[PDB]
Amino acid sequence: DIIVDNQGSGCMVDRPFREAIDTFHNGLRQRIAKGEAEGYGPAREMYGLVYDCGLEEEARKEIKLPGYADLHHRGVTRFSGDYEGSAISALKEILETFSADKNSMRQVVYPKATRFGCSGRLRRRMDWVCVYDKKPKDGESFEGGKPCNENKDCTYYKGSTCEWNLCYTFFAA
Numbered sequence: 743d744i745i746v747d748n749q750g751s752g753c754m755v756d757r758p759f760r761e762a763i764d765t766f767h768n769g770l771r772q773r774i775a776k777g778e779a780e781g782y783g784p785a786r787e788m789y790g791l792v793y794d795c796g797l798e799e800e801a802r803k804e805i806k807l808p809g810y811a812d813l814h815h816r817g818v819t820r821f822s823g824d825y826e827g828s829a830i831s832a833l834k835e836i837l838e839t840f841s842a843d844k845n846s847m848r849q850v851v852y853p854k855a856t857r858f859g860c861s862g863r864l865r866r867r868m869d870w871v872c873v874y875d876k877k878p879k880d881g882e883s884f885e886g887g888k889p890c891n892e893n894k895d896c897t898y899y900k901g902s903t904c905e906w907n908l909c910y911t912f913f914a915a
């Protein structure tokens with residue numbers, strides 16, 4: 743499992759933060775695909791989230807002007823936290839707390855989301871938002887299919903490569 747990156751330098755957030763949030767996201771999703779994340783239910787077809795610098799740039803607009811991402815029909819998650827130590831360990835913790843927010847986790851874990859980007863700002867407090875390309879609906883079921891081993895096991899989107907039992911597409915347009 744490693745970060746899969748799409749496009750350029752709307753990626754302003756430093757590697758270790760970016761990789762911490764990405765590994766948290768795709769780490770969970772991978773366990774849920776394998777049906778082995780406690781509390782999340784039966785194995786299923788899961789797309790990995792491609793880290794998208796464009797979507798990180800939208801996340802940054804979203805912090806600057808709340809409501810922005812919804813205008814573009816995006817999923818959004820938010821996580822914050824006061825802290826005092828290293829900004830990097832604070833974030834590690836904030837995510838753990840964030841993982842106990844059942845509403846937020848619905849977006850994090852949505853099998854038909856295929857890309858995301860997050861941005862954060864320091865005020866000592868940190869605020870992060872993530873933008874996702876597909877937002878689940880309330881009551882929408884997440885179960886279905888099976889965890890990919892070969893590319894053919896990916897049904898949701900057309901041009902998908904299976905890797906680490908996660909399906910990846912770069913064209914879910």
Ligand SMILES: [Mn+2]
Nearest residue numbers: 891892904905
């Ligand atoms: Mn392969």
